[PDB]
Amino acid sequence: GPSFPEPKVVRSQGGLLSLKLSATPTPLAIAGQRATLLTYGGSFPGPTLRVRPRDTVRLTLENRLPEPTNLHWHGLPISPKVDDPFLEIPPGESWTYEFTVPKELAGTFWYHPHLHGRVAPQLFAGLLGALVVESSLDAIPELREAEEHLLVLKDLALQGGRPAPHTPMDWMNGKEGDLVLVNGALRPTLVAQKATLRLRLLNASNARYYRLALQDHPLYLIAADGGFLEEPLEVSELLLAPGERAEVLVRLRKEGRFLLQALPYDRGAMGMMDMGGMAHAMPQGPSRPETLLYLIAPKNPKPLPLPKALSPFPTLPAPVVTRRLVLTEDMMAARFFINGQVFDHRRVDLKGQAQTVEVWEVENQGDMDHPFHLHVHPFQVLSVGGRPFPYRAWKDVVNLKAGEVARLLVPLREKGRTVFHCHIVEHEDRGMMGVLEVG
Template identity: 30%
Template sequence: MSRRRFLTAVALSGLAAGCGSSSEAGEPRPVGKLAFRTQLRIPPLLRPETGKDGVRRFRLTMQSGRTGILPGTSTATWGFNGSFLGPTIRASRGDRIQMAVTNRLPETSTVHWHGMRLPAKMDGGPHQPIEPGATWRPYWTLDQPAATSWYHPHPHGRTATHVYRGLAGMFIIDDDVEVELPDRYGVDDIPLILQDKTFAADGSLAGDPLKDTFGILGDHILVNGTYDPFVNVTTERARFRILNGSNARMYNVVFSDRRAFHVVGNDAGLLPAPVRVDRVSLTPGERVEIVAAFAPGEQVVLRSLSGSAGIDEGDLDLLKIITASRLTASVPLPARLARTVPIAVPPGARVRRFELNGHDAINHKEMDPSRIDEVVPAGATEIWEIENNVYAHNFHIHEVAFRILDVGGSPPPGYATGHKDTVYVPSKTTVRLAVQFGRYTDPRDPYMYHCHILRHEDSGMMGQFVIVEPGTENQVSRTIPVAHHM
């Protein structure tokens, strides 16, 4: 039995034992079926300890527990510093950070800092395992623009199961560029982690993250782990940081009255200027920051519309927004936002091509933890062409920021023109990216690129690259001892 098939079998048996095997029948809950009885949970901010050395130290504990998600039931779940999901980490550009991540789970896991630009040894991919009872202490200096990032497990062959059980949290980066946007966390700056789950009749998690084409497409939508949620808004404008934390589902987000709103940021930072839209789409791992205006005493529902991608079926209610009878004034939306320079493609930039094959290979190769697929010189900007000849995929690259050049030969929507790290790759389409690599060099510790539909990632649709000193690319070994890392 191959390593991948063995890990898949273990994952299947583990989920069946931990979550139950009976699935509640039915399609995703359609528009009009939610009562919006539960106040939206706002994940708490994780407070760091700051020593005399100025380092900000955050503590995370991965643990199991039980959570009341559906009325009258209790669900076995996993979380950080609690039974389900994790606290929001917030830090500023220039901060020196150290994490202490302790694993109290019954199996090995990892924690990946999705969207972070940091050394490969600190990335938290499959080569940085945390054994049960162990503590991992990555550290780095935060040096990137303001953005909405997140953290989640990334164990080889087990990511889908660990995320589905509840291991995910938001990581907000601030910087010293003064932009007049709503910024009071939980008041007018509200995190929204979108996830879909399937529950058995007794309230346990059901469904199989490693079955069928896409794995989990659940029939209950949770926002910040809250089912049937509403949120109270007390200001004229509110900023929503929306993270697609689902295993596979795509969300086409609109307001029920189709009001316009403004996108101010996506994966890797703020846009140069607000973009007015009435709909945004997010595949797993993608983030978007929006600002919407409200009137006193109104109610409006945030929804996801059904699409044709195969991972976005069903019109779904997500969250009801209820405004106060009197709203606190908000500053006008600024005309300019980030000073970030668009990623330009230099003359003669290297072009790398990646073909997504089925659900388990890139360029006809399954993931091999001992194989280095690509070697990149530090500081390079390259063109990556992602060709998808089958059903829906997306593509995430660790460490980098990229700009979407075109999707099937056409420019991306205006709200997706900023810096990103994850992109939707539609069926039968090629997406071209201008990829900007960092300057942390390490010829032995790789970063990942992969489909962020977690069923596909775990099945082998993932590759590895290292960043090295320019001019040394041909001196790097294309194999690494797995025992050294895993």
């Protein structure tokens, strides 16, 4: 096929994307070996769903797993009565998600399981895929003329031809794998045909971070998790925590082979040691550098000019409440807390009012990075660790290093009960999650 593997695309037809997807154990070839994974649509990653604002989506998920599951539409500001995090689809049963794509929306989103206590194993085994929302902004020449690709960043470990089981240490750290894949391929080669690339980036890993950098080149950030920036932002590197997305323009500067790498990054994962007589936790330190893909530039590349503007970010009403959410850890028990509590589905932790704006201060008092995620209500990050964010864009995941505080502006949209949680999904399964009710 094409030298560069990307998940098959399913597009809405006449304003309707109607599709049956089975969640199924699936024999396939991955990274040169046979393995059985858990897939949507028979593929790893699952198929990419490409839609437009106002489209109707009708997804019937058939559960062919030996355990219950469900779907979460990560990043979509739609009703929690549709995107229902408490719903359980039993083995053998089916369920139809139906919703309309919001009018003011664009970017890269994704879908994956969200059944509490079983997210980390099901996601790790291969249950995920992307959802792209096309914009009228795609028709401006500086983007239309770029060469577009999706990069699903997701790692894996295999054992006996199946996803490796979670260890006790895995539940504390979040599981990382030794196979560091792009769209399920091991270090694929991208032979560029145009000088400007437009790359949609998705971290669909359980816990691995990707400190992204392309040899000899800057990246031009044009979209965050849930929408475009106001204008392109030049960066020398780009960290993507679990669950985050970004879209970048790449402007190839000369012919040659350039490595896109995940540079060493220390997210505070921990190992166990025994030196004299102690049996305690020790930092793992930085991840080892990984090559993600080989990027071959075309002959005499002349990149397009950058667009001068993208999408103006909405002026939000003044906020009516400030909240404070504190993250802490119990590493040796693999328990994780928000304001001193673990998740309880019966318990409402926050109660807000639709169409008002809130300020959330989320503070990490643990020693690990925690990427904080809120369903249903995209936010604007004002600052993290005392530093102002250098751009305005919708996000739904924000990474917090040890000790850092993030300040977010959270407009409350759809009414209903929903959740917020760390998107190292092992931490989520182990309790680092709470309930928001909007009324």
